[PDB]
Design a protein around this ligand. Structure first.
Ligand SMILES: CCOC(=O)CO/N=C(/c1ccccn1)C1(c2ccc3c(c2)nc(CNc2ccc(C(=N)N)cc2)n3C)CC1
Ligand SMILES: [Ca+2]
Lengths: 235, 55
């Protein structure tokens, strides 16, 4: 996350971190329930084998609040392709249930129509992650969050050098130096409504980070609600 | 004056659907629709979408 702020205690409890064999985070994820994690299909290539860490806010010093979970089943959207990065979504089923507590709680899955008319129309959403804090740099050791304005699809497509499908959406600033970045991929994009946060997107890609005239690109969760519900029932 | 889910989300805490021409509120998993048929009551200490704050 370039810019933004540090997630304070309990502010981003649905954030999950995918960690490799060396126990280093390489992508984010969103807790959906005690057994399921939402992430980006492309993140599955960043590591042969990986685990999921929840409750972490500072990768540096382990404070006991963290918890590591092995993945039992990986459900990757069969249509994902690096050619277009369309269908950039995956669901992971853990071997053991997550214990919700301080800094560990699921984000709500909204209903499609309501989400599109009430959530997607909000002025802003919130993205978070342990990704790079600068286009060129190391991954953040601290979990950060950033308020990002929803960007109308028209401006989005015109600003992009690559095709923006209907399974994607833009969020962020035109010039302001705030945006998600490498490492935040697979992470949560949530929208607040009456003090309740709903998962609305998955950090997917972007042309650089916080680059002028460019926005952050996210997988549109509303486009896969049926697919997600389907995946959370063995299928 | 007539209007539904388009008017302040139909006064629903969460999901709002217009059935028959009337407002019908619903909630995400982990919540129960309150008696007033509008508010969503958490069933446990860590309902989805709620920050876990204390101070
Ligand atoms: C790392 C892969 O890069 C490539 O395959 C070649 O670049 N190809 C594309 C592309 C996009 C859409 C359709 C076709 N081709 C891209 C591209 C594609 C996938 C990418 C990427 C950059 N960077 C990442 C790393 N994560 C990332 C970076 C910036 C973000 C942001 N600004 N909000 C959010 C996430 N991933 C994951 C140049 C813009
Ligand atoms: Ca820690």
């Amino acid at each position: 996350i370039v810019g933004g702020q540090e997630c304070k205690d309990g502010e981003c409890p649905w954030q999950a971190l995918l960690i490799n064999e060396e126990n280093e985070g390489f992508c984010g994820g969103t807790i959906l329930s005690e057994f399921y994690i939402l992430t980006a299909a492309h993140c599955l290539y960043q590591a042969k084998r990986f685990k999921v860490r929840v409750g972490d806010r500072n990768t540096e010093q382990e404070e006991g609040g963290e918890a590591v979970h092995e993945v039992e089943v990986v459900i990757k959207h069969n249509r994902f392709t690096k050619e277009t990065y369309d269908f950039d979504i995956a669901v992971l089923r853990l071997k053991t249930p997550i214990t919700f507590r301080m800094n560990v709680a699921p984000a709500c899955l909204p209903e499609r129509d309501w989400a599109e008319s009430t959530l997607m129309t909000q002025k802003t959403g919130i993205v978070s992650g342990f990704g790079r804090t600068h286009e060129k740099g190391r991954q953040s050791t601290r979990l950060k969050m950033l308020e990002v304005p929803y960007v109308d699809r028209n401006s989005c497509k015109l600003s992009s050098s690559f095709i923006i499908t209907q399974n994607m959406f833009c969020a962020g600033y035109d010039t302001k130096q705030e945006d998600a970045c490498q490492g935040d991929s697979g992470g949560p994009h949530v929208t607040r409504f009456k003090d309740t946060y709903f998962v609305t997107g998955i950090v997917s890609w972007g042309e650089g980070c916080a680059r002028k005239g460019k926005y952050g690109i996210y997988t549109k969760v509303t486009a896969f609600l049926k697919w997600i519900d389907r995946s959370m029932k063995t299928r | 004056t007539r209007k539904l889910c388009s008017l302040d989300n139909g006064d629903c805490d969460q999901f709002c659907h217009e059935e028959q021409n009337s407002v019908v509120c619903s909630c995400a998993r982990g919540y129960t629709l309150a008696d007033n048929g509008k508010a969503c009551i958490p069933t446990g200490p860590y309902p989805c979408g709620k920050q876990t704050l204390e101070r």
